[PDB]
Amino acid sequence: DESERGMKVIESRAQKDEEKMEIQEIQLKEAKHIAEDADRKYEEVARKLVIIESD
Amino acid sequence: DDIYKAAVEQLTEEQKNEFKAAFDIFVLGAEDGCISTKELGKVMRMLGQNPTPEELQEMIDEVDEDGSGTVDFDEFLVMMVRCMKDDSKGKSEEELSDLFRMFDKNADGYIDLDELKIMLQATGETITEDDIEELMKDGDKNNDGRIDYDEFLEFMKGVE
């Protein structure tokens, strides 16, 4: 029962951890996508800066 | 309005039939015919696009202008052409080369703002002070102040 309760708490916890993990995955991906766009936008302005600097 | 009409005009019969058949997965049956936005990622893949999870979410983020939580059928076609560019034929370089030459009245190898305005006002469509420049800045990828032959071909791919 301790081991079964262990599993119920742990399985639920493992799921909570799976969810927190999924949440960190979603959040890092959103943040990463912000970074993809922040970096993309950076590239657009950095590229434009090069073009504008060249100009 | 007209972007939604145009996406419908640009999809061929063998494609629009798949788009509506797959898009109808958005309603579960015996509901209200809502057609929800969360199902967009699934349909992109059902129709042959191969997006990542970030891309699936971007398609969702770009719809639902009114906060309704749904996607219409014409709205779907507009969102799909911005993801998977299934236009109708999309013409060719030879066809656009001959048409390019018509806007290039002075044979300079590019379309400047005056030619761009004359050709459009000539259609009967009213051209306002900010128009024309808005297209020139779209075709003019190199920021040289005009749309040249190469830029023209990129600019009008998928245009009828």
Residues in chain A: 55
Q: C-alpha angle with apex A41: B64 to B131, nearest 5 degrees?
A: 65
First to last CA, chain B: 17
Asked whether the beta carbons of residue B54 and residue A51 sit closer than 8 angstroms, the reply is no
> How many Å apart are CA A32 and CA B121, to the nearest integer?
45
Answer for the pair B56, B44: CB distance below 8 angstroms, yes or no.
Answer: yes
CA B114 remoteness from chain centre: 25
Answer for the pair B80, B47: CB distance below 8 angstroms, yes or no.
Answer: yes
Residues in chain A after which the chain is broken, C→N over 2.5 Å: none
With contacts defined as CB-CB under 8 Å, which chain A residues touch B143? 51
Q: How many CB atoms lie within 10 A of CB A25?
A: 13
> How many Å apart are CA B10 and CA B90, to the nearest integer?
9
> How many Å apart are CA B86 and CA A4, to the nearest integer?
55
Q: Which of B75, B72, B81 is CA-nearest to residue B10?
A: B81
Positive or negative, the CA dihedral B22, B25, B27, B29 is positive
In chain A the beta strands, taken as DSSP E runs, fall at none
CA B65 remoteness from chain centre: 17
Is residue B58 exposed (0-12), middle (13-18) or buried (19+ Cβ within 10 Å)? middle
Instruction: Tell me the resolution in Å.
Output: 6.6
Residues 10-49 of A with CB under 8 A from B: 29, 32-33, 36
Q: C-alpha angle with apex B17: B11 to B20, nearest 5 degrees?
A: 95
The stretches of chain B forming alpha helices (DSSP H) are 2-9, 13-23, 40-46, 53-61, 73-81, 93-103, 113-121, 133-139, 149-155
Answer for the pair B36, B28: CB distance below 8 angstroms, yes or no.
Answer: no
> Does B50 show up as a binding residue in the annotation?
no
Of the candidates B53, B58, B143, which has its C-beta nearest A51's C-beta? B143
Q: What would the two tokens of residue B153 be? A: 């071909």
Answer for the pair B75, B87: CB distance below 8 angstroms, yes or no.
Answer: no
The CA radius of gyration of chain A, in Å to the nearest whole number, is 22
Asked whether the beta carbons of residue A33 and residue B143 sit closer than 8 angstroms, the reply is no
Method: cryo-EM
